[PDB]
Design an enzyme around this catalytic site. Structure first.
Site, short mmCIF file in Angstrom:
data_model
loop_
_atom_site.label_atom_id
_atom_site.label_comp_id
_atom_site.label_asym_id
_atom_site.label_seq_id
_atom_site.Cartn_x
_atom_site.Cartn_y
_atom_site.Cartn_z
CE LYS C 154 -1.66 -1.33 3.81
NZ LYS C 154 -1.58 -2.68 4.39
CD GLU C 180 -0.33 2.68 8.61
OE1 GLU C 180 0.81 2.17 8.40
OE2 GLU C 180 -1.34 1.97 8.88
NE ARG C 181 5.79 0.27 9.72
CZ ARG C 181 4.86 -0.51 9.16
NH1 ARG C 181 3.92 0.08 8.42
NH2 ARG C 181 4.83 -1.84 9.30
#
Lengths: 492, 467, 466
Positions: C154, C180-181
């Site tokens: 993704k 997310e990260r």
């Protein structure tokens, strides 16, 4: 003695959250009545409890706060109804959303009315032509009939419905008022840009004139999405109860169930199978029973419904899918496998059915497609049983030769609904064996050539088949003559 | 007594009585309504408040509304003047033909026949349907069940049985539509009339009808079967006649209950069902029965949710039957109608001592070969057919032909099959199969055996196909 | 107005007010804290109490603590001065570059554009990615979604698209990192700086960044999407600008919702998700759209839990896209990147009257052969190809060559493919696939087609393979 806010016709919000108001007071409200919020926001009285009324809110509950005054309306929920709505895009309550002005409505109708009983109806007998060979030949739809369009995401379910709405110009632009069909298209949980795309195409096809579009999209409150189907239904009964004919598409009944599930859980009603209310069957039965054919004693009008349901991993045995398949008068099952394979519509012959049978078909069509359905079923089987040419006889070689040719003829593009006599001409060619020696790959091209020929040159045979409504002995002879000869010149 | 409504939530209405609390099962009538609304008392919540199930729509009810205890469970007009008529859950005519002037009235709730009232006569009831007759014979006075998921043939099968049996039957018939399609009660009523089983001019009516369709609130659906069954028990006991009972579809009685169950405050049992499913089904199914007084031949359609025969409902009903016809979408899907599953259908009379060894050896003979073929199916699928022993590729043959010879064009489905309906006599059936099994037609093509009545039509069809 | 903290459970803070109860959605500021702690009202429990969702960790709060009605919903700096800046759920800069000095402020909760405001122009957006362009083409101002289980592609696909599309886009872009990260935000920011889309010297930045990552409490993750969203809405309507909106990952917003939902006291729906899942996705997804005023091309990564696309989250998202790129672990494991499932990706533009019939026929051509290969696979699986028909074996050959030709090296994935990134022009894709279909390369080996751009490179690779 300010006596405007007595607790019998008014109440005050005890609490509000997630679209559910717990109103205090409202001592004289009736179950299912509409109430009003200080903010002009309407709601509906669903739970009448000892100490409070659980009110579902038709809009953003952000404008509602504890303490607000809630007023009865004295009216059980209803909506605008009638010819004024044609060509207009309304929300789940009737309000216009095409910013094209107020609706000039003179009639109203309760969204929730029981379907006419046993006595007021008559067997479905008049065809409801889709324009789609596959459908009109194998899973015939009659007026007053409920036929389900079911399949996974993107298998083409809406297309079936659009082509159908578009095919109705034929009669609507005509003279005869009995053959006319007013359409209703209810979008539920869908996306506004998709609907906007939808109403554009309808406009470009000159179909809006006879269509009403009730829209209850993705951001509309759960209760609007929930109601939307009943709302749209009621607008269709106006035509049904007045000797006119209506067609309603519920696109789709899956997103409504979710809405119902949400509304329902937020009212704290214990979840049931799969998290849905124990009455989701009832949620849809109540609605679809309303599509019906009334007897001449009641106007002979009708309501035909085409509800849509989305399966997952083509699994039709699924609880909701079967719940709805067990209410309608048949189903059109679309498979992604068939679709990718080139078979569009992806109608799955074997799994689709019409509980009305040929009674919803013209004799011309019955004549040509009377046994085709079980023939194709039996063809799909042997086609599988010889995916290894197991010392196959002739009767089955003939069976596979017809099966493939007939499969090609049932194929069809989009937006080009065919006229009944056009279908009869082309199926005829196949069903009679005149194409058993043509190459499968040729069939599609041949049908475009052949149909061209007869439409242009022979409209006398088309107008007779169309008119007589049957295939006489001479028409059948004029046809044999045309196909065989054109076919030959065609395979030069 | 007079109670007041204190809470309304869907089909469930709580009522508070000041003096005199109506017993459980009692019917109460809501005052102030254009139409008759009956509430059946379901529970005693305490504090002189009863929880009840509405027999109709609860729209427009108001907290405080008045309710009178009728003093008795729902009671309906029972007797011969019900024949040729159409009734409600609550016994009201719904055919617009005026009152039903019966001498007596019966409460829809009653105890089931005692053990010493049971009968054990077992007579085959020939139907004209190859499959049923051959493999899962119905029995006169027995309990029959047609199992099937949505749209596989339950009703059509009930339709051809009304034609091949109800029509000649000398005795009454009661057809109770429970939670099914309204369109369908109108198709049947008008068919009964066009064929004189229902007579609107005289007293020659041989069928009473009761309806509580899918457009009704759970409550009505949880009771019509009772009303239907009650009408039938009268002709069984008070007249002593041979009754034919058709119910389509009894699953609806159980779905009705599951739909109000949560509003009755119950922890759900598995699959969402109510915890009282089996007992609820038991006290009902136990009345639908033949006794020494009269005989009932019940044909019940049984819906199978998600097509799963293990679903608590279909699953719980097998025990109440003497014969079962299981229909399958996998068979139907192939175009084989009636779509009965030959290996999942059974009858308590499939006994050599009852139908005879010729009947019995053929049936079992046909089942072995279909089973034998079922097992090979998945394997020749991949590994193909060459390696198979001529001994084994003959059973593939015969099986595929039997599979077809079991289909039949019904007289009530010409609109579906495009074929004239055929009724085959028990001996034409036994013989036809006996010969296929005997190798006497290994030359004709399978297709010759598809959608035909008697074996001779398969032979004729071979020629017609011969070109 | 000043209320008092009555109860605290994770991110659900219940506050009672004596005079003046704040409306739902209003942001309250907790008093007595080293940093800002915004509470968003969620519902009126009655008894002058409001149940709220904290926007940051709630440790340290105390019952009876004072809370102040801000008088409005979370509002954030909107305008061109957000371009090149990194901001919070609650709009404060987090790039240590000072205050975002804007003229206007926008509230993160707005209604979706009306029906009459919708647009229906359908223009194809070419990306240079073979599979996407050929089979499920994106569209300008359209809504795209990349579905993917963990570690399937993704983000790499969003990066490559940022590279291939965002980089040469006249107009602005908004990247919203949701759940997310953090390292990724950092990887991107610095990369954006480097290629100059973020300029810390001039006012020439073309990207505004909003982040609410994997380390935030649920409420923050539940609202950052709305925040990135709002920034984008400003450029669309207040400047009639053509926007690009990238979100990684929108599945996280729904997950965040499921985290607080029990705390809000709701009976759960299926799979433990909140009963309000669809409406929550809906009133949010419906603002991410092109209109008559402006265009929003939005690419959203959609994380699929346990790889189950029937999961309520992903399942409910299909209906909001115009084009979908469904990534597959099975394909990825074969070494095909991007791991796009060709028979599962779709696009409302795959219409002959929009991509032309040449395009429409190659597209359906490729799918038909892969669908056919797909059914043979069961038997190929026990018995291999031997027993296959000469004809069937040709579909298989072609299918395996089409399958390989659908893969391609991304600049962004050069460190892993070991090959130089390629960008193939649409006509090159339509073509290369025609020929394959047409049997013009039945002589080349499969391996020739793996990891290449244009067909011309597939022929070459074949020579090198000798």
């Amino acid at each position: 003695a300010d006596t405007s806010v007595d607790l019998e016709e008014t109440g005050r919000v005890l609490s509000i959250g997630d679209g559910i108001a717990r109103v205090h007071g409202l001592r004289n409200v009736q179950a299912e009545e509409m109430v009003e919020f200080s903010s002009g926001l309407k709601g509906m009285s669903l739970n009448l409890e000892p100490d409070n009324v659980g009110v579902v809110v038709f809009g953003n509950d952000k404008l509602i706060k504890e303490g607000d005054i809630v007023k009865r309306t004295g009216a059980i929920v209803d909506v605008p109804v009638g010819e004024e709505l044609l060509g207009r895009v309304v929300d789940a309550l009737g309000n216009a959303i095409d910013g094209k002005g107020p609706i000039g409505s003179k009639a109203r109708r309760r969204v929730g009315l029981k379907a006419p009983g046993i006595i007021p109806r008559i067997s479905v007998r008049e065809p409801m032509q889709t324009g789609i060979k596959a459908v009109d030949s194998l899973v015939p739809i009659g007026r007053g009939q409920r036929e389900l369009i079911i399949g996974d995401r993107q298998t083409g379910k809406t297309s079936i419905a659009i082509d159908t709405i578009i095919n109705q110009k034929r009669f609507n632009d005509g003279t005869d008022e009995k053959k006319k069909l007013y359409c209703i298209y209810v979008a539920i949980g869908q996306k506004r840009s998709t609907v906007a795309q939808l109403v554009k195409r309808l406009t470009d096809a000159d179909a809006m004139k006879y269509t009403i579009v009730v829209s209850a999209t993705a951001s509309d409150a759960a209760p609007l999405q929930y109601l939307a189907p009943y709302s749209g239904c009621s607008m269709g009964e106006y035509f049904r109860d007045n000797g006119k004919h209506a067609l309603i598409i519920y696109d789709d009944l899956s997103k409504q169930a979710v809405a119902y599930r949400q509304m329902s859980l937020l009212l704290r009603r214990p979840p049931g199978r799969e998290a849905y209310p124990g009455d989701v069957f009832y949620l849809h039965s109540r609605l679809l029973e309303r599509a019906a054919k009334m007897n001449d004693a009641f106007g002979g009008g009708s309501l035909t419904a085409l509800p849509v349901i989305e399966t997952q991993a083509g699994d039709v045995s699924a609880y909701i899918p079967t719940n709805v398949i067990s209410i309608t008068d048949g189903q059109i099952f679309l498979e992604t496998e068939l679709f990718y394979k080139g078979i569009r519509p992806a109608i799955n012959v074997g799994l689709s059915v019409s509980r009305v049978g040929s009674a919803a078909q013209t004799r011309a069509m019955k004549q040509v497609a009377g046994t085709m359905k079980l023939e194709l079923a039996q063809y799909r089987e042997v086609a599988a049983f010889a995916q290894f040419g197991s010392d196959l006889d002739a009767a089955t070689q003939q069976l596979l030769s017809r099966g493939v040719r007939l499969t090609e003829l049932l194929k069809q593009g989009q937006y080009s609904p065919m006229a009944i006599e056009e279908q009869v001409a082309v199926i005829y060619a196949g069903v009679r064996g005149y194409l058993d020696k043509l190459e499968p790959s040729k069939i599609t091209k041949f049908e475009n050539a052949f149909l061209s020929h007869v439409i242009s040159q022979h409209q006398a045979l088309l107008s007779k088949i169309r008119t007589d409504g049957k295939i006489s002995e001479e028409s059948d002879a004029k046809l044999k003559e045309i196909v065989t000869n054109f076919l030959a010149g065609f395979e030069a | 007594t007079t109670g007041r409504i204190v809470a309304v939530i869907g089909a469930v209405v709580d009522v508070q009585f000041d003096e005199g609390l109506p017993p459980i099962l009692n019917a109460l009538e809501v005052q102030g309504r254009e139409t008759r609304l009956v509430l059946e008392v379901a529970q005693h919540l305490g504090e002189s408040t009863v929880r009840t199930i509405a027999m109709d729509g609860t729209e427009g009810l108001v907290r405080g509304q008045k309710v009178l205890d009728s003093g008795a469970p729902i009671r309906i007009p029972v007797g011969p003047e019900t024949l040729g008529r159409i009734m409600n859950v609550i016994g009201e005519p719904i055919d617009e033909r005026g009152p039903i002037k019966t001498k007596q009235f019966a409460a829809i709730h009653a105890e089931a026949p005692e053990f010493v009232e049971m009968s054990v006569e077992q007579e085959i009831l020939v139907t004209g349907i190859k499959v049923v007759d051959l493999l899962a014979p119905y029995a006169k006075g027995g309990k029959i069940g047609l199992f099937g998921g949505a749209g596989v043939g339950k009703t059509v099968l009930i339709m051809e049985l009304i034609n091949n049996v109800a029509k000649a039957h000398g005795g009454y018939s009661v057809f109770a539509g429970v939670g099914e399609r309204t369109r369908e009660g109108n198709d049947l009523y008008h068919e009964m009339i066009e064929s004189g089983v229902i007579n609107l001019k005289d007293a020659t009516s041989k069928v009473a009808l009761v309806y509580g369709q899918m457009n009704e609130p759970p409550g009505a659906r949880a009771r019509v079967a009772l009303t239907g069954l009650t009408v039938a028990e009268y002709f069984r006991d008070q007249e002593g006649q041979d009754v034919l009972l058709f119910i389509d579809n009894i699953f609806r009685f159980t779905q009705a209950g599951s739909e109000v169950s949560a509003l009755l405050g119950r922890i759900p049992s598995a699959v969402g069902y109510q915890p009282t499913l089996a007992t609820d089904m038991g006290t009902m199914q136990e009345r639908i029965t033949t006794t020494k007084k009269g005989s009932i031949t019940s044909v019940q359609a049984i819906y199978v949710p998600a097509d799963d025969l293990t679903d608590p409902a279909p699953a719980t009903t097998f025990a109440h039957l003497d014969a079962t016809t299981v229909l399958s979408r996998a068979i139907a899907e192939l175009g084989i109608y009636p779509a009965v599953d030959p290996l999942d259908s059974t009858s308590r009379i499939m006994d050599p001592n009852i139908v005879g060894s010729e009947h019995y050896d053929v049936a079992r003979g046909v089942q072995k070969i279909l089973q034998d073929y079922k097992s090979l199916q998945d394997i020749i699928a991949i590994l193909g057919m060459d390696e198979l022993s001529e001994e084994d590729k003959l059973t593939v043959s015969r099986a595929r032909k039997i599979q077809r010879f079991l289909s039949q064009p019904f007289q009530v489905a010409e609109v579906f099959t495009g074929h004239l309906g055929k009724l085959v006599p028990l001996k034409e059936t036994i013989k036809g199969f006996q010969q296929i099994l005997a190798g006497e037609y290994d030359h004709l093509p399978e297709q010759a055996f598809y959608m035909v009545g008697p074996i001779e039509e398969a032979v004729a069809k071979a020629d017609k196909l011969a070109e």
